[PDB]
């Protein structure tokens, strides 16, 4: 499972894999990997299934409550910290969570917080979480450029995922792409790896500079 | 029934303050006097001892003068019983502050805990308030000398000379007049001893019918050295002023 999210001029690019397995045989090419808390917050699945599921709907209750009662737009800054503080209470209770708390509010701009079961909350432009993460990081890093267009940003994201898909076998059923904007998230379709592999291997010429 | 055997008197009067609290104030004004004088090279405390006789032990005059700290002491006006409960809690509060922040309690900080409990006593339970007023004598290294007072109403103020217990009006009137800010310990004592005389009507006033303490800079400290006088030391100073009364 390999998930990445990077901050750029147009908002946020969030790109994720999907894969469910019975053996090494791909049982379903399908499963969520963005838990859509509400349209303004995303939390991405890379932790325990139940842990992520339980606390992230519960996080949806604290956001909904804050805005209903206090009549104030809740920050990403507030969303991560509510989460981190409860996490430390359920620490050494058997918790496994690796999520990135994504939002793009009026008052902060695009903001991506990495939040783990250790309770750590870090702000960064670039966070990759997984276990094909080091390889996925490579593709992204060598072609990184903050000033970029949303379309070209999507193609770089999806090639990065592919790179990680090919080597690591815990990704690569399908890719789901989402671009997270101010007014909410826009889905950029579901792309099959079979068709996507042959184009990239020829096209990119990274690790493929003499075709292999 | 017994839901109507409730006194219902720890609720407000229309006078802007609880029944029991206002009535309790009267009780104070019918028990011993404490006088607090804050000087420019000490703090002088005088209290007139309520019952003095041979049947009592006359060599004891710590019956209302307790030091809460190394540099904070209080004077009681009210009844022994009422006092003791706040004394013990102020002592601990001193130790909690000391332990947490590595520094001694400031005089107002200490005052403020005691006063929030006094209010509390009527605010939770319905129980009766205290019957004690303190005049606090202390030093802090942020304002110089501080001399304060609290009452069972939970209102507190700072003053440069005040009296509480019986004969507040008479003593306060005289104090405001002779007050200076170039007085020394010894000039204050003389002053104190005059005031006490003018509020007590006697042939003579004796040294064992007084409880006295002053908190001066000292000459064994750059701090403040707390001197608790006992009858025989009261006898000496009475000669020194040449004020026999």
């Amino acid at each position: 499972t390999t998930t990445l999210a990077f901050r750029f001029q147009g908002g946020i690019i969030v790109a994720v894999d999907s894969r469910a397995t019975a053996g090494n045989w791909v049982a379903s090419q399908t499963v969520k990997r963005v838990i859509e808390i509400n349209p303004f917050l995303l939390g991405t699945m890379a932790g325990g299934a139940a842990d992520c599921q339980f606390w992230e709907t519960w996080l949806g209750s604290q956001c909904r409550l804050h805005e209903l009662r206090e009549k104030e737009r809740i920050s990403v800054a507030a969303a991560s910290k509510i989460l981190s503080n409860l996490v430390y209470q359920y620490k050494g209770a058997g918790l496994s969570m690796g999520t990135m708390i994504c939002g793009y509010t009026r008052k902060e701009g695009p903001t991506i917080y990495y939040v783990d079961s250790d309770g750590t909350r870090l702000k960064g432009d670039i966070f990759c979480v997984g276990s094909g993460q080091t390889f996925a990081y490579g593709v992204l890093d060598s072609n990184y450029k903050w000033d970029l267009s949303v379309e070209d940003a999507l193609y770089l994201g999806k090639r990065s995922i592919l790179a990680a898909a090919h080597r690591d076998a815990y990704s690569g059923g399908s890719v789901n792409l989402y671009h997270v904007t101010e007014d909410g998230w826009i889905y950029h379709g579901n792309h099959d790896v079979g068709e996507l592999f042959w184009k990239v291997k020829e096209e990119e010429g990274s690790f493929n500079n003499v075709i292999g | 029934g017994s839901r109507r055997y409730d006194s219902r008197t720890t609720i407000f009067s229309p006078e802007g303050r609880l029944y029991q609290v206002e009535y309790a104030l009267e009780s104070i004004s019918h028990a011993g006097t404490a006088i607090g004088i804050m000087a420019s090279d000490g703090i002088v405390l005088a209290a007139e001892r309520k019952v003095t006789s041979t049947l009592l032990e006359q060599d004891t005059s710590t019956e209302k003068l307790y030091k809460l700290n190394d540099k904070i002491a209080v004077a009681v006006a009210g009844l022994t019983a009422d006092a003791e409960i706040l004394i013990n809690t102020a002592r601990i509060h001193a130790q909690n502050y000391l332990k947490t922040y590595n520094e001694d309690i400031p005089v107002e900080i200490l005052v403020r805990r005691l006063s929030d409990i006094k209010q509390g006593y009527t605010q939770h339970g319905g129980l009766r308030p205290f019957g004690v007023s303190f005049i606090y004598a202390g030093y802090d290294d942020r304002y110089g000398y501080q001399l304060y007072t609290s009452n069972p109403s939970g209102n507190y103020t700072g003053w440069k000379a005040i009296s509480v217990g019986a004969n507040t009006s008479a003593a306060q009137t005289l104090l405001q007049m002779d007050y200076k800010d170039d007085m020394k310990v010894d000039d204050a004592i003389e002053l104190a001893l005059k005031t006490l005389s003018k509020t007590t009507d006697s042939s003579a006033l004796t040294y064992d019918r007084l409880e006295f303490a002053t908190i001066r800079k000292g000459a064994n400290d750059g701090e403040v050295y707390q001197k608790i006088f006992k009858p025989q030391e009261i006898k000496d100073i009475l000669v020194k002023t040449g004020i026999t009364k």
Binding site: H66, E70, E72, I74, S75, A77, A78, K81, I82, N85, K107 | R3, D6, T10, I11, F12, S13, P14, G16, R17, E108, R112, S115, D116, K118, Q119, T122, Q123, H124, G125, G126, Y143, Q146, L147, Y148, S153, G154, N155, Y156, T157, G158, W159, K160, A161, I162, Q172, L175, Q176, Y179
Partner: protein, 242 residues
């Protein structure tokens, strides 16, 4: 016992405890807040005829809740301290959990809930103090002034007065300040506040204490000396009709 009938309605619909609470306020000191539109001025009376005390051992009229949130009161001293302690715990808890320097309104919601709380439910008796909570919310040039009561209500208010001589200061705010068009100068806002509390204190500038709060933590309390120069000026305006 004491968990019941401290507070109940009459058939006339008055509450006993609330009705005797409002009476402690009229008796006590005087506090007023006048808002500019880029300042908020809080003027306070502290009234003592007995002169044998200092200001530096008598508690201040304006207490800091935060550097950019201030609290003023009229009423019992004892009760007000209880309320002040909650507001500081609520400032720091908010900062911790939502990771935003405080919004002044939320803090009103906490102090007001407590005040509601001891009235509605027994095992505690109500408060006898009314408060003014004022400050600036971050990223605002617009002043905030609130009033909260022992009832536990609150609302936001352009100038407001409580305590002794509420009528007089009220008339003055009605005829000399507008909700529509207030002072736009800091100076004129100071002038107005002094004018209002001077008519009622029945002393000079040595028993009016002015504190001016300009945006986000900028607080300066003008001294007796500074107020006197406006006090002079005021006797001159009044001798155009005398």
């Amino acid at each position: 016992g004491y968990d019941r009938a401290l507070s109940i309605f009459s058939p006339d619909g008055h509450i006993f405890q609330v009705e005797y609470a409002l009476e402690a306020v009229k008796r006590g000191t005087c506090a007023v807040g006048v808002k500019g539109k880029n300042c908020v001025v809080l003027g306070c009376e502290r009234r003592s005829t007995l002169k044998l005390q200092d200001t530096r051992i008598t508690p201040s009229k304006v207490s800091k809740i935060d550097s950019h949130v201030v609290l003023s009161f009229s009423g019992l001293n004892a009760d007000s301290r209880i309320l002040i302690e909650k507001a500081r715990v609520e400032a720091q808890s908010h900062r911790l959990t939502l990771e935003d320097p405080v919004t002044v309104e939320y803090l009103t919601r906490y102090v007001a809930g407590v005040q509601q709380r001891y009235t509605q439910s027994g095992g505690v008796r109500p408060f006898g103090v009314s408060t003014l909570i004022a400050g600036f919310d971050p990223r605002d040039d617009e002043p905030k002034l609130y009033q909260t009561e022992p009832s536990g209500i609150y609302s936001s208010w352009s100038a407001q007065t409580i305590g002794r001589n509420s009528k007089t200061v009220r008339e003055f705010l009605e005829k000399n300040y507008d909700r529509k068009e207030p002072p736009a100068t800091v100076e004129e806002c100071v002038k107005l506040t002094v004018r209002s509390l001077l008519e009622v204190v029945q002393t000079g500038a040595k028993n009016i204490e002015i504190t001016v709060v300009k945006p986000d933590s900028d607080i300066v309390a003008l001294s007796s000396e500074e107020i006197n120069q406006y006090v002079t000026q005021i006797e001159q305006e009044k001798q155009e009709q005398q």
